Amino acid sequence: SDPSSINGGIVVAMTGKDCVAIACDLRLGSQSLGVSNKFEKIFHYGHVFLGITGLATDVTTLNEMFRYKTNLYKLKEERAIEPETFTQLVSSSLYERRFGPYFVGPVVAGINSKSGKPFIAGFDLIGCIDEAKDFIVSGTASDQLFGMCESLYEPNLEPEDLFETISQALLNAADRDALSGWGAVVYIIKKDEVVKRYLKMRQD
Amino acid sequence: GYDRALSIFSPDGHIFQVEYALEAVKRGTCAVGVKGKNCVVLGCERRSTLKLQDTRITPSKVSKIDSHVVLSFSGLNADSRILIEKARVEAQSHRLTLEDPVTVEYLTRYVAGVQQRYTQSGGVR
Amino acid sequence: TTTLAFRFQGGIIVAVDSRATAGNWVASQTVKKVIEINPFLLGTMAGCAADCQFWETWLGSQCRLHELREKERISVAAASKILSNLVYQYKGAGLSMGTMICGYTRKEGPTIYYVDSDGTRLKGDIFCVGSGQTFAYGVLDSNYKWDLSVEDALYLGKRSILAAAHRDAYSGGSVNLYHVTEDGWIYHGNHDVGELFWKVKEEEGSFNNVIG
Amino acid sequence: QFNPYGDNGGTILGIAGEDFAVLAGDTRNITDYSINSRYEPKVFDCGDNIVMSANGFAADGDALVKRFKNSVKWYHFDHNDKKLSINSAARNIQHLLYGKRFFPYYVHTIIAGLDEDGKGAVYSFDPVGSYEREQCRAGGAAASLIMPFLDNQVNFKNQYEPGTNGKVKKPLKYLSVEEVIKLVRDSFTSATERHIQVGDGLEILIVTKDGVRKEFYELKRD
Amino acid sequence: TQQPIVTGTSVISMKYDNGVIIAADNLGSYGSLLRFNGVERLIPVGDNTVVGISGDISDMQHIERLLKDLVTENAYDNPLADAEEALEPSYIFEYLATVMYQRRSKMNPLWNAIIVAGVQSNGDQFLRYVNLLGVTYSSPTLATGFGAHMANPLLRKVVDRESDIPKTTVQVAEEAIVNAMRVLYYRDARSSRNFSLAIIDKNTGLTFKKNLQVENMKWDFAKDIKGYGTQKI
Amino acid sequence: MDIILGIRVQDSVILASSKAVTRGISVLKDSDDKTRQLSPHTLMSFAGEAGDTVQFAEYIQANIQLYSIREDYELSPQAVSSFVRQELAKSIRSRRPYQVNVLIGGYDKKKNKPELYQIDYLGTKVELPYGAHGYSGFYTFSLLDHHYRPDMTTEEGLDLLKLCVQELEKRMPMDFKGVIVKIVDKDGIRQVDDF
Amino acid sequence: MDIILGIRVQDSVILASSKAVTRGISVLKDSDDKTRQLSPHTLMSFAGEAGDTVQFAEYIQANIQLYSIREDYELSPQAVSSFVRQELAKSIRSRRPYQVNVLIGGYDKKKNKPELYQIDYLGTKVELPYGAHGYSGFYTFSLLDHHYRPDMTTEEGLDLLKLCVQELEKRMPMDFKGVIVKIVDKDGIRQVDDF
Amino acid sequence: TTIVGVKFNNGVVIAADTRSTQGPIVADKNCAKLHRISPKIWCAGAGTAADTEAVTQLIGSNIELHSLYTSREPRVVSALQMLKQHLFKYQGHIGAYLIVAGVDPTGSHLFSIHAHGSTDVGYYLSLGSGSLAAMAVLESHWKQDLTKEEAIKLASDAIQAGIWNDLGSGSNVDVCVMEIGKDAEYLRNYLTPNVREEKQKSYKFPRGTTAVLKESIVNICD
Amino acid sequence: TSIMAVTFKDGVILGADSRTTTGAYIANRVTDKLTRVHDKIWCCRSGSAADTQAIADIVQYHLELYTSQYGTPSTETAASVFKELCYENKDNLTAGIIVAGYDDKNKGEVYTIPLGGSVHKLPYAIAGSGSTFIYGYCDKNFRENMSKEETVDFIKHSLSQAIKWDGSSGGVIRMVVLTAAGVERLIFYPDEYEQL
Amino acid sequence: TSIMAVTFKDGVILGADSRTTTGAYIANRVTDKLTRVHDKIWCCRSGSAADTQAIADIVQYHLELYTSQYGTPSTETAASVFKELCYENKDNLTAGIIVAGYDDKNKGEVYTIPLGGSVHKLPYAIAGSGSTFIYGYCDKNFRENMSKEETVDFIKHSLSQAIKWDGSSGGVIRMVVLTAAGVERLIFYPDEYEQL
Ligand SMILES: [Mg+2]
Ligand SMILES: [Mg+2]
Ligand SMILES: [Mg+2]
Ligand SMILES: [Mg+2]
């Protein structure tokens, strides 16, 4: 009965040279039972990408909530929300439920359309912002991801090289976690193009 | 506890207590075993100095150890009961753990082992 | 863990996985969950690694002492009972074992005994033990027949572990196969689930739930 | 109520080559959020070309190593100075661990050396005595950080041959002592960055047919 | 299963170029009550070892008796008891460490943290720690209780690693110890002003100092501190 | 309340639900229909805490029927499933949550496609080719992984379903008294009377 | 281990015992014989804690067989039941008691009468015309109170037993996979192969 | 976490380390723990990270509105009073432990605030897991009538003590100096004594190493 | 904590130590436990620092508002406001407060308010964890209508012993003198009081 | 309970109250808590009455057997035997014993043995629930080498205050004087000591 490890799953985000990457596994289970291998944990609102790990009902609920809020933002502001602004919105929304929190580990990723600066961020379940140049990790194999990212990561990687680093970080972290894996998706995000790749991995 | 080594070697290399136990066997009533092609027969002598006996209730010379094995003897009658009891207990213990009754060789090996133990244990004859 | 063993026309199939877990941490993917007691006796391991590994190797020593003393290979029944009587002495102390003693002898023929740490001992044709036992049962029962060939039987045992490795989070790594005949046991290799899954998916047309 | 166990932190790492083996471990000893020692060795030469480390609760670790060292000494007395093979040592350690099944040594044990064919060997144990021979094993506090990195770099897991449509795997091969030490040093520096109980110093024991050699490296002290 | 009743607080120690220094205050606390004020928690063994003990005082007194008996036992049938076959710090430590671990393994510990400071026969400095769990470790600076949190940081600024030991004199080392004892008196609620200090040098031998006091204390700044926020008067 | 299964085939969705209602050491009923028609082409089966299951199912039914009348229009299975999920998502953080797990089998008339949604009491929604709640999945999922094909007919889906029930009847500890099978397709919802 | 029944009729004792062996959410076996022949005219069925049941049954069996060999004589059902009771009476105040309930069905050759004894794990012995252990009694006792007659034949006793099994199969929550029936009479112990 | 506050001649200085933990794992190796309540009133937080940030931002927002309303520069006692009444109302459930420091028309101020709502005054303070290591330094070297440069040294020395001796603290030292009559100077990464050493190897993969099943262009535009 | 308030000829004196502990750690060794709620009405705080600060602040607010409307409040009135807060919120408070004040009519007065929220007017009062060790000393040495110097010596000697035996008490001895003359703050350092 | 032992010029004096309570009920108001383990070695008992009586009886046996073999035991020896019992059986005992005795060589000596079973030789000792209230008074008023009359007044005044504040203490004040002259029993009633 630990909300953060009932459904399982992982998200990882990295920065590169004029680009960002965000990736996640596809597993959704009920403890030992694998239920779905199509459960994607990454969503996007305009050009800002959000990955969410943890309790699957809250993953879904928060996606619907941030879609709701970014749509109203766009109508009123007459422009798409930026990663820096969205990060503050995620934090505010999570802390609003301080004593009844969503059991999640969100990860923001994106490129600022004005400045062109690659941006990533992570949060704890009550909204504490973890800003980072290098990488952000979340989920039931976060320890494994921290180890993989710390050793494999180097600054200023090109999109094609960054893809290999983030993919290998996720895959090998997932294979050392029982509640993660069952497929994987990787988003490579450039200033004005986004490539989505499904990875081949072991299905156990 | 009584520890005395009763069964011991002599200068000539004999254990007299074991050899004197054989003399007790030589005194006992005769017992014979003959095995055929599809059977075994155990014959036993009963001395005829004892009349007015009750043959219904008098301990029989041949004793069943299990439903498939029997034991006859010659020598001290009281001593034989201790071996027979131990043998019967081992027979049931074997069925319990091995899920199979004892072989005749196994049962013999057990009884023989008990007899041997009493030739080099303290305080026993 | 997922282990199985079933009886059929051509003897006994035994199949296990190779994953070891400490909570949600995958400790190992290359664990030997079959113990080779002797050329005619196998033992499967589920539950606590140390309990299974220690006591089943101890069991082999006891089986060896039996054939020295009795000049005859121990029966599957007698071997299984030594283990079951041992764990029964420890009942309540916290041993965790789900084991299957499999073998062939002249008097018994191909025989499988299920033995666990709370003292249960059962003879049977089909058994699956472990966290993924239900997944293995589902595939095994629906495709099982007595008149299976040795080839089809080996595959079914392999396919049943694969099914469990896929669905059960605490089962995986690889599949270890064994076949037991009148002549003894025969090892049929280590099969990595990483490659085996895609091979089976393609050739069989199964596993449509997965993104191919 | 009295708690007989404690956590002394630290992490260990064993890798097996073709004709050699390494057993590495950091020299930091901790309790809670305090540092007890920046240099307290926990990888030991036990004789007969066997190196051993029992990481976790240091008191149990020291006790186990001490008992195994003593087991080697008596193996020489009782069996005409015969060399204790790595496989025989492994089985012996299982009985030491399982002997306290109901009051366990709270340690992850790893031993390293050469097998009877002269090839590199590493054996790893759980607290209660289950063991397995492996090419690769990380143990202790930062095991979860280091182990998946080893799967990727030592055993080449999830790495396919470029251009083969993910059909042909990257072939397995033995690593040189130079390449292994690089992976060890990079593993420990990475662990030192992301784990608070890991740091101060790194001590590596290398085992070849010639003997047991030592190497020491500084780690971050924060 | 125990609980400590009458307790002693921090024991602090460090190595210097020619030997070791160890110190501990003279208090025997009874929970929050500062019950006993004349308690010696540094116990010399021979002329080359000082054992410093914190935690349960009843168990400390038991350990005193064990050490006292060890000296007696070592002298039996031993013509070289005051020479080559005299008790070393390493012998005394290993004995205690064996006892501490045996007692924890029987779920009946000696509720203590112990530091054995001394100088070996070959001139090498000996400094090692053992506690109720049987846990042992060595370091250029060692401390127990609050001393681990507050003294070690100050002592490690003097001797941060092995190579700093030859560069550290007895004057500098003692000053750091005395300074650490003052800091503990400021910040440890179960500490006293009165303490004992022992120096084991390879040349000058065992120097045992009793009835030392914490002095040169800064309290004057307290007069200016008023209220807890807004209060001006 | 125990066994509820779902299989989405080529042109229909098949729901199978156990007939047993057990309280204590007594099977009180052996003909219980654990499902409610939410709309002509949408069916919801349910299982969980006693009382809550029916109360929730009927509450949803009323809301969907209210929507149908108001707009003179049938909501899509996707729309109904999202509504149901949200209600369960609200419920889990209430004073006393609905402990009810559901399967929603529907035929989308606009897409001309069958759809099966699995939703647990936490509000965890997933679209699946086949689904189950409770201990049922531990046997059926592996069986369906093997035998299921996406292009199967309704008759083939029923034979596949028979294979699941047989396995459950063999290995399940409790007697669930068989199942009621219902088919959801383009022509609506009908019950298989002989199973 | 769950259902064990006993019915003493005119000239025999009939024991019916369930075939299911369940562990967790899996029926591991559906052909388990929960009984041991203690002597040619005495049969004991058993149910309770896993491991203990068989261990106890076989221990008793060995002791009675040992007695048979020693005296070349079969103990009466009353004598065997008293021995069994005493062993359970010792057990309940041990460090770890045998959690095993038994029925002892025997035919006394000296009295020419069938006898049925019900003994629970506490060592509580009662001689009865019909008996049961566990939840079984809550259904069967009332049924037998109604239909049972003391002068019934073996065939009538089997039909009465069929009526009990049917009621259990209808109202019991768990699937116990039918029963193995054995008859104890003057001619010894035999099994009814088709039930 | 290690945080300190030190008063001097014409102002006050605060300092902090830059390690953010997640149990024994280091999540952020260079987080900013020094927060702004108002331009010349800064805050250092320990305990529950979200609570320290949320509470400092809320009071900072209300302080700004108060400053606009009163046409006056915000006072430290106002931030202190607003923080402690908010924290007290939640009875310690908001795990915010702060060191508050700043300058205003009344002078220079230094306070500590605890989660339950209690406040303290002082010339030198320390909070966090490394507070005892830091306070040991402060009790050794603090004196009356410190200069700006002496205070910055003392403060950063106190943080270093925590960085080296406390496992919960690490990486860099941040400082903020608030002097009377001057603008406050925030010194991000004032010290950087824990630089990661060059790795022994580059783990840049050959392109094509990762097996792929599907590629697709994602539409982010309208 | 060791706190006390003593009435004498010219008025009243409040006394206190300066130690605040978190377990065995001294969080503050120079705490000011003597707090003003009005010009010549002060209090000594013991128990939860969060609770006693919150209470004292609310009382200070009430007495400031009282003064604006009705003029200077009596010491009894101040004690009544403390009591009202401590009594009505007794389930959620851990506060042991001694109230002391000087009127021109009533002269020096002392009220003690223990955990439950009862009120007790006394010639002198002692409270805090360290007070237990000086019940005997204070009872034997307290006299009514003492001089200023005698009352200072009494408080100094009393708290010196409380500090000596109580680990939770220590640091400096702060004192506040309340008379017709005005308000005087006194401080006494360890080197003086320890060797009494 | 309120118990104390005080060394002085001519020897040592043991003092104690006479109240034994079961909760708030006084089971015995005239208890004798001063108990002889040898001619001129006595003890004051506090804690579990069953435990302290059992211990004192065993000690009395050991010292009687000691005397038969080795002659008169020292006060240190008596304290050692108490300690051995209290320390080795610390898990099953609740005993706080003060040992006091007179040698001709060593004169008056006092040893206190708290709960844990540690031993502490002191010029004077106080123990029992009521001792907490007189740590301050005793520390300020105790002098070494007092006369008999001065030591009697010290114990009387001290226990009077302990009794005054401790509900678990009361009744009469019993005292036992140990000198070269011999053994003298003293008793003091409420009407005398209450109004000191
Ligand atoms: Mg995985
Ligand atoms: Mg799996
Ligand atoms: Mg580190
Ligand atoms: Mg004090």
Swiss-Prot record, chain A:
A GO BP entry: proteasome-mediated ubiquitin-dependent protein catabolic process
Record-listed cross-link Glycyl lysine isopeptide (Lys-Gly) (interchain with G-Cter in ubiquitin), residues: K69
GO CC annotation terms, alphabetical: cytosol; nucleus; proteasome complex; proteasome core complex, beta-subunit complex
Sequence intervals crossing the membrane: none
Gene label: PUP3
Protein name according to UniProt: Proteasome subunit beta type-3
UniProt similarity note: Belongs to the peptidase T1B family.
Record's subcellular location: Cytoplasm; Nucleus
Oligomeric and partner information: The 26S proteasome consists of a 20S proteasome core and two 19S regulatory subunits. The 20S proteasome core is composed of 28 subunits that are arranged in four stacked rings, resulting in a barrel-shaped structure. The two end rings are each formed by seven alpha subunits, and the two central rings are each formed by seven beta subunits. The catalytic chamber with the active sites is on the inside of the barrel.
Covalent S-S links between cysteines: none
Curated annotation (Swiss-Prot), chain C:
Enzyme class, spelled out: hydrolase
Tagged with keyword Chloroplast: no
Chief localisation class: cytoplasm
Protein name, entry field: Proteasome subunit beta type-5
Keyword Protease on entry: yes
One GO cellular component term: proteasome complex
Organism field: Saccharomyces cerevisiae (strain ATCC 204508 / S288c)
Alphabetic keyword roster: Cytoplasm, Hydrolase, Nucleus, Protease, Proteasome, Threonine protease, Zymogen
UniProt similarity note: Belongs to the peptidase T1B family.
Subunit structure, interactors included: The 26S proteasome consists of a 20S proteasome core and two 19S regulatory subunits. The 20S proteasome core is composed of 28 subunits that are arranged in four stacked rings, resulting in a barrel-shaped structure. The two end rings are each formed by seven alpha subunits, and the two central rings are each formed by seven beta subunits. The catalytic chamber with the active sites is on the inside of the barrel.
Binding site for bortezomib: A49
Name of the coding gene: PRE2
Catalytic activity: Cleavage of peptide bonds with very broad specificity
EC numbers on record: 3.4.25.1
Disulfide bonds: none
Residue spans crossing the bilayer: none
Misc. remarks from the entry: The side chain of Thr-1 acts as a nucleophile, and the N-terminal amino group acts as a proton acceptor. Present with 8530 molecules/cell in log phase SD medium.
Biological process terms in GO annotation: proteasomal ubiquitin-independent protein catabolic process; proteasome core complex assembly; proteasome-mediated ubiquitin-dependent protein catabolic process
Active site residues per record: T1 (nucleophile)
Cell location: Cytoplasm; Nucleus
MF-aspect GO terms: endopeptidase activity; threonine-type endopeptidase activity
Curated annotation (Swiss-Prot), chains F, G:
Pfam families linked to this entry: Proteasome
Cellular location(s): Cytoplasm; Nucleus
GO cellular component, one term: endoplasmic reticulum membrane
InterPro entries: Ntn_hydrolases_N, Proteasome_beta2, Proteasome_bsu_CS, Proteasome_sua/b, Proteasome_suB-type
GO BP terms in the entry: proteasomal ubiquitin-independent protein catabolic process; proteasome-mediated ubiquitin-dependent protein catabolic process
Residues modified as Phosphoserine: S76
CDD domains for this protein: proteasome_beta_type_2
Note: Present with 21800 molecules/cell in log phase SD medium.
Sequence similarity: Belongs to the peptidase T1B family.
Protein's name in the database: Proteasome subunit beta type-4
Organism: Saccharomyces cerevisiae (strain ATCC 204508 / S288c)
From Swiss-Prot, chains I, J:
One example GO MF annotation: endopeptidase activity
KW Repeat (keyword) present: no
Pfam families: Proteasome
Highest taxon listed in the record's lineage: Eukaryota
A GO BP entry: proteasome-mediated ubiquitin-dependent protein catabolic process
PROSITE patterns xrefs: PROTEASOME_BETA_1, PROTEASOME_BETA_2
Keywords from the named record: Acetylation, Cytoplasm, Hydrolase, Nucleus, Protease, Proteasome, Threonine protease, Zymogen
EC code: 3.4.25.1
Principal cellular location given in the protein's record: cytoplasm
Subcellular location field: Cytoplasm; Nucleus
GO cellular component, one term: proteasome complex
Catalytic machinery residues: T1 (nucleophile)
Record carries keyword Nucleus: yes
Record field: catalytic activity: Cleavage of peptide bonds with very broad specificity
Biological role: The proteasome degrades poly-ubiquitinated proteins in the cytoplasm and in the nucleus. It is essential for the regulated turnover of proteins and for the removal of misfolded proteins. The proteasome is a multicatalytic proteinase complex that is characterized by its ability to cleave peptides with Arg, Phe, Tyr, Leu, and Glu adjacent to the leaving group at neutral or slightly basic pH. It has an ATP-dependent proteolytic activity. PRE3 and PRE4 are necessary for the peptidyl-glutamyl-peptide-hydrolyzing activity.
Family: Belongs to the peptidase T1B family.
Additional comment: The side chain of Thr-1 acts as a nucleophile, and the N-terminal amino group acts as a proton acceptor. Present with 7250 molecules/cell in log phase SD medium.
This protein's name: Proteasome subunit beta type-1
Organism, scientific name: Saccharomyces cerevisiae (strain ATCC 204508 / S288c)
The encoding gene: PRE3
